[PDB]
Design a protein around this ligand. Structure first.
Ligand SMILES: Nc1nc2c(ncn2[C@@H]2O[C@H](COP(=O)([O-])OP(=O)([O-])OP(=O)([O-])OC[C@H]3O[C@@H](n4c[n+](Cc5ccccc5)c5c(=O)nc(N)[nH]c54)[C@H](O)[C@@H]3O)[C@@H](O)[C@H]2O)c(=O)[nH]1
Length: 184
């Protein structure tokens, strides 16, 4: 009846975004819960919906405690994201897998000397095509951004034929195509 808890390096918060066009974007975001142990992560993951079962327009976000999953956050305003784009068939094939490995990538501190630059990750469930992104705190840190993208792409088994791009939040938020600051 003894249950050991394995600590994580950081405390993490899972966020949920609901699809509702009658409310503003900020009003559709809500905090689910937080955790800082391996056991509490799986407890949360095992009782929430899989990403492939979300209604279109919904998001999941896992960010470090104190960072909100929005581009106006103080830890995100100068940063950016490595973006992955999936087709419709990739949803049943790879969406749930890619998201779980992403979650374990985050909470495992798998980015060597640049783990502190990581802010979180977001998965968007969209009818036009699902997206998964890992957010970093500073888009001008070339060593941090390129290292995080290389580790992330390899840890998710993506073939080298597919090229993933990094984009600044400030550039994305003012888009009137969002150019890539880096490619891996
Ligand atoms: N009323 C109502 N309308 C909604 C709602 N959701 C969509 N629409 C409208 O629906 C139509 C079709 O687009 P869509 O279905 O493709 O939504 P999308 O596919 O999600 O596109 P998006 O990603 O361009 O986001 C679209 C807009 O969402 C707001 N947004 C998104 N992020 C997350 C975010 C963070 C970093 C990088 C990129 C994104 C943030 C953020 O961090 N901080 C703030 N302040 N705003 C953020 C912002 O305004 C953005 O321009 C369009 O007219 C939409 O405006 C809604 O909740 N309510």
């Amino acid at each position: 009846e003894h249950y050991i808890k394995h600590p994580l390096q950081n405390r993490w918060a899972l966020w949920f975004f609901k699809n509702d066009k009658s409310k503003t974007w900020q009003a559709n975001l809500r905090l689910i819960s937080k955790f800082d142990t391996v056991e509490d992560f799986w407890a949360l993951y095992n009782h929430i919906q899989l990403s492939s079962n979300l209604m279109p327009g919904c998001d999941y976000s896992l960010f470090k405690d104190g960072i909100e999953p929005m581009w106006e956050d103080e830890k995100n305003k100068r940063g950016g994201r490595w973006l992955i784009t999936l087709n419709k068939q990739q949803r049943r094939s790879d969406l749930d897998r890619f998201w779980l490995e992403t979650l374990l990538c985050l909470i495992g501190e798998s980015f060597d000397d640049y783990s502190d630059d990581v802010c979180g990750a977001v998965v968007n469930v969209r009818a036009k095509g699902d997206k998964i992104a890992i957010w970093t705190t500073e888009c001008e840190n070339r060593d941090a951004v390129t290292h995080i993208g290389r580790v992330y792409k390899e840890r998710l088994g993506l073939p080298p034929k597919i090229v993933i791009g990094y984009q600044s939040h400030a550039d994305t938020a003012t888009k009137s195509t969002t150019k890539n600051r880096f490619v891996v």
